[PDB]
């Protein structure tokens, strides 16, 4: 069908714009060094860069988390036109309802980033649509030390601010700016939650 490249380099790219976010905020320009052709580049790596966010001043962390949804915003509002050229039938730009574009996104975006549907969707009829997936793809492979499970959720909480930006981008492709929050919401058998506004 389409030309394809491998998922394991993309998922590992997708895991680490948060060290890129603290390396863009903290480095406005124990840290290490390397060289190139009569130069140097000062390096700091990911284990010693997400752990500067467990010791983050509160305006610094909230300054970082705008950038993660800004990345998600740019990739979402650039992704929506090519998914329109995929198929995207039977919906409009002003789009007076909301469930027909929540049927769009779980079948049509989240398959093209993660390969499956958002398998639950709950309908508050005044416009708060709950999108629940059970096993989220990039957080399949993260764990803390020997039963220190309390201090890792608050450690790993920047990593869900990419699908804030995705659903901001695919709705600013259809008109406007909205309000978004995230949850964790564990399963019932062998979680994540997003609103709409």
């Amino acid at each position: 069908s389409l030309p394809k490249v491998s998922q394991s380099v993309y998922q590992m790219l997708l895991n680490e714009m948060v060290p890129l976010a603290m390396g863009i905020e903290r480095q406005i320009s124990i840290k290490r060094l390397k060289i190139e052709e009569h130069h140097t580049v000062d390096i700091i790596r990911s284990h010693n860069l997400i752990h500067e966010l467990y010791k983050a001043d509160e305006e610094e962390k909230e300054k970082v988390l705008a950038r993660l949804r800004n990345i998600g915003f740019q990739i979402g509002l650039k992704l929506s036109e090519l998914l329109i050229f995929s198929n995207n039938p039977n919906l409009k730009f002003k789009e007076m309802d909301l469930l027909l574009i929540m049927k769009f996104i779980c079948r049509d975006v989240w398959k093209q980033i993660f390969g499956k549907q958002i398998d639950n969707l709950k309908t508050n009829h005044r416009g708060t649509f709950y999108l629940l997936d059970y096993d989220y793809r990039p957080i399949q492979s993260f764990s803390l030390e020997e039963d220190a499970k309390n201090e890792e959720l608050k450690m790993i909480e920047p990593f869900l601010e990419i699908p804030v930006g995705i659903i901001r981008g695919v709705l600013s492709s259809l008109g406007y700016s909205s309000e978004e929050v995230i949850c964790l919401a564990s399963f019932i058998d062998r979680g994540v939650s997003f609103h709409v506004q």
């Binding site: 740019q74 036109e81 329109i84 050229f85 198929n87 039977n90 919906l91 730009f93």
Partner: protein
């Protein structure tokens, strides 16, 4: 087959591009012609005699009017609100359907080449100097 103007209109009725592909001609002589036709062709999208249905992945072409011996052809894609209007001169039309589908792939090239530079990931987001002066150096590549 070779058009005499193309035009792209955004979510609003603000024009993104009103482009002549035979650019600096002997009969330039005004740009008012091929402009007031686009200004009336935005008004012919809420005319009730023609109607664009909302079920399919491939949005459809129409043949809206003819004036000055120039036929217009327009397509509201329904998702990004994009109103795209083209014109041809009258006797370049053959009346057949192979050129009609050639007109449809002229649309499927120009929609593709606009959404490519809508997804050019180095521009600042807006209708700046950059987007129009990239669209012209791609349309000069398409239309000589």
């Amino acid at each position: 087959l070779r058009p005499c103007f193309v035009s792209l209109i955004d979510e609003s009725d603000k024009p993104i591009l009103i482009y002549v592909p035979n650019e600096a001609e002997n009969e330039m002589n005004d740009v008012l012609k091929y402009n007031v036709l686009s200004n009336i062709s935005l008004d012919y999208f809420e005319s009730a005699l023609v109607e664009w249905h909302s079920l399919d992945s491939k949005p459809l072409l129409k043949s809206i009017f003819q004036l000055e011996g120039v036929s217009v052809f327009a397509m509201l894609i329904k998702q990004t609100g994009l109103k795209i209007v083209i014109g041809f001169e009258q006797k370049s039309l053959s009346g057949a359907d192979d050129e009609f589908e050639a007109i449809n792939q002229i649309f499927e090239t120009v929609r593709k080449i606009y959404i490519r530079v809508k997804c050019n990931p180095l521009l600042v987001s807006g209708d700046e100097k950059s987007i129009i002066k990239s669209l012209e150096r791609k349309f000069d590549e398409l239309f000589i």
